[PDB]
């Protein structure tokens, strides 16, 4: 029960693993304004957490879509302590020689308005609400950005990017809004299942989206995330400490200990 | 609570940041062992948790010590679940041009033995029961693993160190054990020093952090020590921080994420924007 | 002459940083094609190098533009050895809270098609013959693609995009063509912004550099535009850079590494050693 | 020729890589001071650059044969523009759990002593001719300073700190003396030919001795390094931007394009 009394906005969390977010906050006490897409899957949240969850129908793209998630925020809780900028949009980790001449310009814009300009607003939108209430931002980035072949080209710029939203509005933003991310990767959510647990994953096992939850609650709990602005806790099973000929290094450990 | 019936290892934890890592964990439902220098410190929390706490006197360098503990926490709780490689040395921000030449070998080996041996014994005693419980490794670095200025070379240097621990352990002990480190800033330790190197500079170029925090501080203010511990019960608690391995959290208030000008961009928001 | 018998193309190569290479390429021996927006410009420099550069006038946020470029740098030279993506807009600095709704949306595309999507045309354009002389591509970043208060959250995040680039970019051109990044810092550009960003604020929060260098620049100077050529003709030579991919180099005179009351830390050295 | 009239230390540098930047540096040159265990190997060094290189027999761990070697540097050239703390050792890439209690001990000071010590040491040393000279440092680092199957523990944490030497020194001996790093992998100098290519180095091939060594030329060019200071140049093939299931992303790129 380590959310009490708290409300949180998240955008896209109306499915996968912003969805998660929804019920792991719900289930700690907390109260979720939800912005996305889907009318149905909001409707459908909504009556899964009975006045505990409030979902407004929108585009994460539209500013406007924005403030007004914030306004509804407002209106049922009174107040917003976590946004969780979250909405994404993937580009197949489809390789530049891959997208074609006639595509790249209108792929460039729907993929960088949603996964950069989405998060922006967002921020933009609840700026009074957060400043307000001295809360904080916790973005969900993504394993690509930090190292490459998570995605293509698009996908990697976009959340390389949303390190820099970090950054500049973790500066920016101080001392009364701390801004954070968690950069999750190797999710139940182009790869082999088999080469994933051996050459990408050193912790072997494919988690499961309620295992991504807990960041997220970390960073929006009221006095334990206090010292973090500006943090990036990359939450990927390991992708950037996997080895060379295999990602984990010690698999035959408890028969190396006699165990 | 987040670790009820859970067991933490942590070194250097009877004082400081280390000290409110237990107070901490054992309010989080955990039983704690603790390795330190300190006797009576030790006695001192072993009274204040009951038989929620066990305290050891030794030294982390000491691989003889680490392992003594490791049985220790064997002994009393039946298991170790979290091990926390937290006992630190400062250099007082010495830089090199200040370091005696006479005085420079001996405080190398001091500093790197506690900093950074001191941790690979501390992984290498509790190895054997964090396999068994296919358990977590969380390492205390700081600011200075990662940017200058928060100490001197040599400090700078084995935290730095630390880092490189972080991930060839994260490496080493997949997919059973996970290795992270949490890298702690604006808390007001006094931090020790070797006697190797001497008492010349304490009070003026190890500036004050008051005087100086709209430089070093974007939250804009110094965080208690408290605040610190939630970062380290995160990766304790099984179900939260499973998919982390690897993983570096900068805790330091945005030291690294600070302005040009002043540490924080953001003074005149309220007034921008009306509250 | 490192670049001898070499060619490279060079975006946003007729004023700034991004001219100063040119005149450092040709007197490296290579031979340079350029795309830029300015017709005067373009044959300002065209005139001054005689037969071994020749500029495209266009738009970099355009790929018919890029490809344009490409194939004209063919044309005349044959081949392309190095391509160095360079046309960056500045967002004057500008923060969140000063964007202003009306403009954001128009800001924000105008920005991340030249800084990032100007780039990937670059690349798309000029790929097939990179990989035919397996050559390489430099990204021109800044220290805005690392640590902020470099620009406002839209120029931050391109540049930061730009390091996904490369990163990217060296794991998909491998192992034919090389991808790496040069982050310039204390050079003296104006840096051009976009019209649906207002002239609102330009003088008085995008703060000069002589006035704040003691808190931005370590080297304790601000370096002349020539100074930044050497590492782009670093991976323009073939024989000097092979096994970098995917390389960062932070050419921003420690803006990363500055010190927390000052940028320097030893100002007082030759005082303190004699000199 | 753009080492012209150029002073440079480099320790560990009788043989393997340092051996390469000193043939280098004197046919760029420069003038080369070299400290290094032996006796043997630094006169036929010395007969190789007649009287553009001269080599001191020492111990890069004792801080007196590091201001020696700085003081016959002085002796021979009167002037020291760019150290190159190299001297380094390895730790056979050896597990934890495969360092042994009776060895750990003696192992972490031995290979401390050189990797890191050995560089605060030359840094010390040359400090007084490098604010004379308003020059440059630029330490030999690796792969193992930044990701993790390069070295075991050992290695990795001498390697690590080396990155603190960089930015700690880069910051201290500002704004009289640049400091920086480069970070070479992957090299003709435990893991296999044919893995090595295919799951480590996107660049395809083993790079040569000789091919490393620009890099360092750079750093030690009058005016083509200025801005430069606290930089970390990684210089491994690639390592740090590897695919999971393939080292490189396009090998099949000719004819994908039909070039």
Redesign the interface.
């Known amino acids: 029960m ?1 959310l009490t009394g708290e409300v949180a906005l998240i955008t896209g969390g109306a499915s996968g693993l912003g969805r998660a977010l929804v019920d792991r906050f719900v289930a700690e006490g907390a109260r979720v304004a939800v912005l996305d897409k889907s009318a149905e899957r909001l409707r459908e949240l909504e009556v899964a957490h009975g006045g505990n969850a409030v979902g407004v129908v929108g585009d994460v793209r539209s ?1 406007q879509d924005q403030k007004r998630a914030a306004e509804r925020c407002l209106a049922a809780f009174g107040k917003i302590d976590t946004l969780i900028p979250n909405a994404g949009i993937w580009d197949y980790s489809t ?3 891959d ?1 074609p ?1 006639d595509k ?2 209108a792929a ?2 729907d993929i ?2 949603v996964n ?2 989405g998060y ?2 967002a ?2 939108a609840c ?2 609400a957060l ?2 209430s001295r809360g904080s931002v916790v973005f969900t980035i993504s394993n ?2 930090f ?3 998570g ?4 996908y ?23 801004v954070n991310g968690v950069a ?3 999710m139940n959510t182009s ?1 082999p299942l088999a ?1 994933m647990l051996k ?2 994953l ?4 494919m ?1 499961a989206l309620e ?5 997220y ?2 960073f929006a ?1 009221r ?23 295999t ?5 035959d ?2 028969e ?2 006699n ?1």
């Open positions: 380590k500013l390789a530049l020689a997208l001449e790249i310009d460039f814009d960088f308005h950069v300009k922006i607003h921020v933009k700026l009074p400043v307000s690509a950005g190292y490459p072949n995605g293509g080209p698009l990697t710029a976009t959340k390389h990017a949303v390190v820099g939203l970090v950054r500049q509005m973790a500066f920016e933003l101080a001392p009364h809004v701390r999750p990767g190797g790869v080469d050459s990408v050193p912790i072997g096992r988690p295992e991504y939850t807990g960041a609650v970390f709990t006095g334990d995330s206090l010292p973090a602005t500006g943090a990036l806790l990359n939450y990927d099973g390991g992708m950037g400490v996997r080895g060379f000929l990602a984990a290094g010690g698999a450990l408890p190396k200990l165990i």
